[PDB]
């Protein structure tokens, strides 16, 4: 797995990200936590992004 | 451990008003009544069956 | 699905006119005739066969 | 299951069908064969539908 | 149980048969297929490029 | 059999490549790495693209 470390890495380093959906929109904020389908993005609020709608996760 | 699970049932019990965001952008909004591997229903109006596959993200509204 | 199957199963065995929005955002309209693992059957003028990967949601109209 | 009955009974009985894919586009024919994963859909040529981009099968 | 995908496009591939594959997003890619395998379609145009199938809606003779 | 060593090929050469994303975007650089469901793409930084987005991988 190179999935794993990627995220673990921006989450455990706070690194500020963009997320990219499938659907063109830009999601912004850090990473708290993932598991095997979803991540925690977390801007002002929280939100669960589903990996299924994510094309392309970036540090910003 | 599931982020998932924690996250939906704390909504679900919670009660709380939840956005949900579609992958096609539409955005719904109701309260959380169950979910299972595959779906969310969420009641507002009425109660409605919502497909994981089409979801993009969930915040509480 | 511990959910999933007892919605659509009341919707059929009740004949509930239902909606079912596609992921693109059509929505369909009919009655559910059946439905497995894979696929929907609803019938309005004809009989025809959708796919869940396809449906966003299923609400009674 | 629903699918091979509902896809043979088209074919049986050559009726022609309208298969919606997920982005809208409208194909038509006659259900040639189909698999686990594809429709054959017959028309002025013989193409191949993968299932994971259908929305909806209708007799049209 | 018998697959239609795999002799479908494997005749394509062995008779260097013109294919349209129609993507997801309507973009229609032309060229000749070269090889596949489960996942992915190397369809070969004035250069070689890899196809996911999960982009794919149809794949056209012509 | 044939996703693999195409990527490896790539990736081993370090030649230019353009990934298109299912939404038309088109994302250029070197693979820097890829597992079952993702590949890192280097271009001015790291990103992580999730094969599920993907249509196309090309050398550029
Ligand atoms: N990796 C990507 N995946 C999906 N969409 C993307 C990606 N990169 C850029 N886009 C989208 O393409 C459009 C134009 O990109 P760009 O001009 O770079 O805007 P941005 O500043 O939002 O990245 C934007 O809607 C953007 O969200
Ligand atoms: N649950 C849903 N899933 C997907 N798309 C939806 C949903 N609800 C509404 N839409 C789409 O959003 C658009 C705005 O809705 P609108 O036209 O006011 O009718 P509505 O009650 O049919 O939503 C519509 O074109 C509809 O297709
Ligand atoms: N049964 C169906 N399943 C999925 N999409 C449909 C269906 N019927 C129509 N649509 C979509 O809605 C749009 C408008 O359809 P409509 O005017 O009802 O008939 P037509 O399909 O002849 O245009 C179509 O372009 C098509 O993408
Ligand atoms: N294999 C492909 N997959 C997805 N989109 C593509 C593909 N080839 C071209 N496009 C899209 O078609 C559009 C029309 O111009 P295009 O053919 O892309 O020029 P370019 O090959 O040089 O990128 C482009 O914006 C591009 O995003």
Known sequence: S?????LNALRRERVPVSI???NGIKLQGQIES?????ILLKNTVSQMVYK???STVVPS
């Open 2 to 6: 190179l999935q794993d470390p990627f």
């Open 20 to 22: 990219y959906l499938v």
């Open 34 to 38: 993932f598991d095997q389908f979803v």
């Open 52 to 54: 299924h709608a994510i």
